[model samples]
Target: PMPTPRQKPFQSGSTPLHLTHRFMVWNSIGIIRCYNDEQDNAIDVEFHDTSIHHATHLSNTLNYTIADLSHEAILLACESTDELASKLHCLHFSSWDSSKEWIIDLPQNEDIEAICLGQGWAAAATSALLLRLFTIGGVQKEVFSLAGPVVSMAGHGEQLFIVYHRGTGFDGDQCLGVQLLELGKKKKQILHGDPLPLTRKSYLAWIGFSAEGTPCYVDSEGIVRMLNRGLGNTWTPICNTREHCKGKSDHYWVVGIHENPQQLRCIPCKGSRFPPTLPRPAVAILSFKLPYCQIATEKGQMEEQFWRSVIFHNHLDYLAKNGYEYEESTKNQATKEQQELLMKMLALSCKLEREFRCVELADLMTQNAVNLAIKYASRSRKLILAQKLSELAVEKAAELT
Candidate 1:
C-alpha cells in the first residue's frame, strides 16, 4: 500500500520556524510511527520550514526506520541492512535552517531498530547487544553494552534507561536492565539486574520514566511494571491486571506519563492472522481520573463532540427506523420531562457554538494569534465544547435557512 500520511500538514502558510511551536505541541500527543518489514509499513514526515514545506518518506524496503519529534529537533534511525553488521545510521534535524546538524554511523551489532529522544539526548538500541546515546548535535555521548539484544530506550534529564533481554536459548530468560547515565560526569549506574525478569523469551518492548520521574516498563508479556526509583530502583508490576479487564497477549504498547492524570496504555494485536487485513489493536490508556470525565475532557472536547454528534445522528436514524416521531412524545410524564431537557440542551449548545466561532474567527485574524488560538482551542474542554456548539448551531441554522 502507498505510504499513509505520517503527519498532517502544518497549519497552512506557516513557515517551519513559525511552526516550531506547533511541533512542540504535537510532541505532547505522544503517538509515534514505527516501520516493520514483515508488515511492509511506510511513514512520511511533513512540516513547513521558512523557505518550503518538506516531507521525507521511509518504508519497508528502507528497513522500517523510527522517527521521534520530541525535542526541538527530529531524530531518525535505521539499522544497516547487513545481518551480521553492527552499525546503525542516525540523522538529526536540529533546526528549520537544517544547517546546524550532524549524521553519525555507530557500531550497532544487531538491528538498531528502536529509539527514543528527550531533553537534549537521544537513545537508540540494536539487536546486536549494544545501546548508544548521542547529543542533539550528533555527538557520540556513551555506548552501553547489554547482555542480550537491546530492544527499547528512553531518556530523561541527566539519566537514560535501556531495556533488553538476557540469558541463553531462543526463548531464553528475559529481563529489563536499566543503566542510568549521568551526562555531566559521564558515569553509568546500573539500576536493575543484568537480566531482570521481563519474560521467559526474547521479546520487543519498552521502559521509560513517568512524568514525575518514576521508572516503568511494559514487558513482552503485556504487563506494565512501575519501578521503585527511590533507593533499590526495583521494578513493580503495575498495569494489565485482572481488575483492569485487559486481555493477555497485547501488542503495540505506548506509555504517556506526562499527560494530565498520566496514563499507561496498550494495544493488542490478537486477531492479526492475515497480514494486510489484521485488525489494528485497540489502545487502552491508564489514568487515575474517572472514565466519564476522562473521556469528555482529557482526550479533547472536539473529538468527544464529533463522536457524540455521530451517536446522536445514529439515534435519530434509529428512531426513524422504529417509526417514532422525531420530536418528543408526551405519552408519559417522564417522557415529557426528557423532551424538555433535550430541547433545553439543544438551545444551550447553539449558544456555545456561536461563542466558539467568534473565538476561532478572532484567532484567524493574525498568524501569531491564530497559532495561539489553535493551541488553546485544541485543549480537551475547549475543543469539545466548541465542536458541540458548532454542530448544534449548524443544525439550527440549517433549519432556519
Candidate 2:
C-alpha cells in the first residue's frame, strides 16, 4: 500500500500560531500579520523559526495601508493624504537587511488593489485594470492593462500568478481567469487558460504557488484546488476543508500555504470578527493529502506522467530556442529525441496497462516511427525493448487496420 500522507500542525516551538490578527500573508520564509485593531495598525513579520524580524505599527510609523512579505523583500504601499480627493501614490520596499530601503512614487492615479513580491520584482494591480511592474530596486519597469481587475496575485521564482474575475458564468458561478507570467526572461510567453468556474456563493480565500511551483487556490468552501499542467492544465480539487474540520468547516479559513513544510495555515473567523476564546485564536496547520491508488498503479502512472512531462517541456524549450513552427522541415535532433522519449513512454505504458495512453501512443507511431524506435532500441543494445516495440507496434497496427 502507498504510504498515507502526513497531516500535521505548523507551529512555533510546539504551538500553532496565535491568530490575534486581521490580515495575514506568508511565504516559505516567514509569516506576516496585521492586527485587528486598526487604531494601532500593528504588524508583525516573523520567521518560521520563532524569530521576530519586524514589529512595527504599520500606520502610525510606516503610514502604509497595504503590505506583502516574501523571502526576498517586504513591500508596503498606500501613502494617502487627508484630501482623499487626490490620493498620493507611493510604495516602500525593504529587504530583511533593514539597511536596504527605498520608496518609489507610483505614477498611476488609480488605486492599488493588490500587490505581490517576486524574485527581483514587485507588482501592483490597480483599480484601473492596470498592472504595474517594478524592479526590486524601486524602479518602474512595465505598465500594462489587464482584461479585468486582479482579484489576487502570488509570485514564486520567475512565475507570477494573477487571478482575475472575467465575468459571471451561466449558472451565476464566478468566472475567474488565471494568468501565468514569466518575469525573469525579457520576453518569454504569457500562458493564460480558460475561465475557472467557482461556486456562486464561495469567496476566494487565497491564491499562491506551492514550493514546487504548482499554482493553487483556496475558496471559502475550504476546497483547495491546484493546477495540473500534466493533465491538460486542468484545476483539480485535492482536498476539502470539511474533510479536516468536520462540523467546524465554516469556522476556519485557510490563510496561506507554507511552502517549505508543505502546510496550509488557517484561522477561525466569522464575517469580520474572529473567535474570542481565551487561548487566543490559533492557526491550523494542515498538509495536503493527495489521492493515490494502489502502489504499483500509482508508481507506474506517476513515473510515466513525469517522463511525459519532460518530453513536453523539451518541446517547449525547443520552441523557445527555435520559432514556434512544427513543420516537417523544422524537425531536428531535438525533435528526434522527443520521438524516442514518446516511444519509450509508449512501451512503458503498454506494460502499465494504460489503455487510453496506449491508444494515443499507437496513433502517434506510424510504421516509420515504429521502425525508428526499433532502430534506436537496437542501437542502444536493448534487444528486449526492440522486440517488445516490434510486437506492440504490429498489434496496434493490426488493431488500427
lDDT winner:
2
Give the Cα-based TM-score of candidate 1 against the true structure. Answer: 0.49
Q: What is the C-alpha RMSD of each candidate to the true structure, in Å?
A: 20.1, 10.6
Q: Give the poorly placed runs of model 1, Cα more than 4 Å off.
A: 1-42, 45-66, 82-97, 107-114, 126-130, 169-176, 185-195, 199-204, 246-252, 258-260, 268-283, 288-401
Least accurate 10 contiguous residues by lDDT in model 1: 6-15
TM-scores of all models?
0.49, 0.61
- Candidate 2 per-residue lDDT, tens place, 38-64, comes to 356565666664443544334425444
Error of 1 at 300 (Å): 33
What overall lDDT goes with each candidate model?
Answer: 0.45, 0.58
Clashing pairs in 2: none
